[PDB]
Amino acid sequence: SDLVSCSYRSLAAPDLTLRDLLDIVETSQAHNARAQLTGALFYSQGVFFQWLEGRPAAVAEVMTHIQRDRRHSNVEILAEEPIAKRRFAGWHMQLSCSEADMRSLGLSRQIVTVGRSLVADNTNIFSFDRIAAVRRFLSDVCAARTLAPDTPVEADTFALYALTEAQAGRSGRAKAVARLSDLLSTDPLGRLTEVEELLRAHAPTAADFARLFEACAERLTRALAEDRISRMQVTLAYSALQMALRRIHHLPDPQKSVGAVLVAGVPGHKPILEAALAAEMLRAVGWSTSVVHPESVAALAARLKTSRTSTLVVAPSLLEGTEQEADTLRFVSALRARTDLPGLSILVGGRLAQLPPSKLKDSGADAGFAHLALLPAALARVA
């Protein structure tokens, strides 16, 4: 064989256009054709996935150029593996984007459309599940269209690919969450290294961390309810998780950003972990994010009229939920009263996000996210 594959994830320049994508595709088609490289490029919501395959030398050279490109950043290698045969034969470099992005760019082949519609807001689907699903889907479309070019492929076909990948990961993740919950319930600070190794193995991205934390959080909420652990124990666990999070994920603020967003806790609530997670997730998709823990409504009012950052995410506290709801209501309402800003957008999480959007209209919050990992998606809708 002696064929190798390399795949990465990167953050497209916030000002990326169709002309750019097309230039990339043409340059790549020409060069990959000469150098005997094949693969696919997937663009969705400011993010790139690329797969490249060929002889080692060819892949290395082209990656040397790509890594230095200025139309994307935060290039993260995902795989460098030997393959037995090409997954994208005949595709020197094929472009593909999501259905939503297809709408947003005004496109309708030859660009392979991927329908994320049915699975995008499914919190059981982890980041690597989505990556693998896109890979398998595109490789399959490549085979298919090699066999029958004029035979169209249903976009929402991708849904099944994603769901299947996630289901494959499900049991192992259940084990991880169980083991984790045990650690957090016993002595999470005495065994922080084990907590970290677990989190590092099962949560490659910040959104994955958030998924695990949501699962653990309902587990421990149950435990505390049944008086199986103490409040002090939940505090310990919370500290441990903050430390583990900072050790593992700590993205710098994107220099080229898609926009700016303020992440705040409700005064008295200390959504330290959840706000940190919110910031990591939003930074990972290209948002400039600031975390604020105000102790008054007026403070945040000041920071907002000073920042002119028209978007505010109220991070929920998923472990102090005795009175998170009415507190958040009062806080957001008050904020709206002290404010004179028609462009301001407010997003809310937690139990408040579980109410029907009629209540959301009634609330003064603009939109909700019933789960942390849904935050990026909820934000994009408002922007």
DSSP tag of 139: H
Residue 17 found at the interface with ligand FMN (CB under 6 A): no
Q: Are 271 and 313 in contact (CB under 8 A)?
A: no
Based on the shown chain and the rule CB under 6 A, indicate whether residue 205 belongs to the binding site for ligand FMN. Answer: no
Q: Smallest gap, in angstroms, from Cβ of residue 206 to Cl ion?
A: 10
Chain-centroid distance, C-alpha 44: 11
Nearest to 12 by CA among 38, 53, 44: 44
Mask of contacts with ligand FMN, 56-85, x by CB under 6 A? ------x--xx--x-xx-------------
Q: Is 24 in the site for ligand FMN (CB under 6 A)?
A: yes
Q: How far is the CB of 136 from Cl ion (least distance, A)?
A: 4
Least distance (Å) from ligand FMN to the CB of residue 283? 20
Q: Which backbone phi and psi does 341 adopt, to 5 degrees?
A: -140, 95
Could you say whether residue 126 binds Cl ion (CB under 5 A)? yes
Assess 187 for contact with Cl ion (CB under 5 A): yes
65 labeled binding residue? no
Q: Is 7 in the site for Cl ion (CB under 5 A)?
A: yes
Helix axes 231-248, 192-202, angle to 10 degrees: 60
Residue 124 assigned ligand-binding role: no
**Nearest C-alpha neighbor of 296 from the set 275, 271, 272, 267:** 267
CB of 351 to Cl ion, least distance (A): 26
The one-letter amino acid code at 294 reads P
Q: How far is the CB of 155 from ligand FMN (least distance, A)?
A: 22
Q: In the structure encoding, which two tokens stand for residue 120, read together?
A: 């995008």
Cα separation of the two ends of the chain: 47
Q: Which stretch binds ligand FMN (CB under 6 A): 45-53, 96-104, 253-261, 356-364?
A: 45-53
Q: Which position among 27, 167, 230, 354 is part of the footprint of ligand FMN (CB under 6 A)?
A: 27
Strand locations in the chain (E) = 3-12, 38-44, 47-54, 72-83, 94-98, 112-114, 259-264, 287-292, 311-314, 345-348, 367-368
Determine which residue in the list 28, 44, 45, 288 makes contact with ligand FMN, applying CB under 6 A. 28
Interface with Cl ion by CB under 5 A: which residues? 7, 79, 98-100, 116-117, 119, 126-128, 130, 135-136, 139, 175-176, 179, 187, 189-191, 193-194, 236, 341, 343
Residue stretches of the annotated binding site for FMN: 31-32, 50, 69, 71
